[PDB]
Amino acid sequence: AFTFAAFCYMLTLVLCASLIFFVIWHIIAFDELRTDNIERICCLLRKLVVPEYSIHGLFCLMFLCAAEWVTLGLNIPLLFYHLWRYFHRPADGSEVMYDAVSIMNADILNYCQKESWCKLAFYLLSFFYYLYSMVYTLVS
């Protein structure tokens, strides 16, 4: 029984499989920072920030329309986190955030390294959670 909410699970599996691929360059370019060039990785990783956040802004709009009050709750602290991680940080004001070319300041490399294995944690088990609630609705 194909429903509208079941399409909202098929669409996010198309998109969150790229959202794990956004944050695989989160950890590999940090691996290039720990082995070493800085303004190269600054100019790269600054770009793909508003994509990895506003795609998450899509789903919080989406499951509201899908009227899934479970899965709307299971990502709304991350949207609260994506908003909070944003708005203090573009005080530099070059394009968006996440590098601020003098990134080599202490304690911000490891705090973003916390976030490196935080996104790769959250996006992965949710990817199998959207595939869970896909098959839940699609053959019910």
């Binding site: 029984a1 194909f2 429903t3």
Partner: protein, 49 residues
């Protein structure tokens, strides 16, 4: 004849026989009554098409 004939007359205005009309029929929508949620008979294409 006439005791039972006077019974069904009495059974009528007491409201007992039509309570028995309820009693074995009122609760028997245990099937779900799916006719109740189907009176639209909508004719647009759905996702299933």
């Amino acid at each position: 004849g006439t005791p039972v004939n006077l019974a069904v007359l009495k059974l009528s205005e007491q409201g007992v026989l039509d309570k028995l009309k309820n009693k074995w029929w009122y609760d028997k929508g245990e099937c779900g009554a799916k006719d109740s949620g189907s009176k639209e008979k909508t004719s647009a294409l759905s996702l299933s098409n």
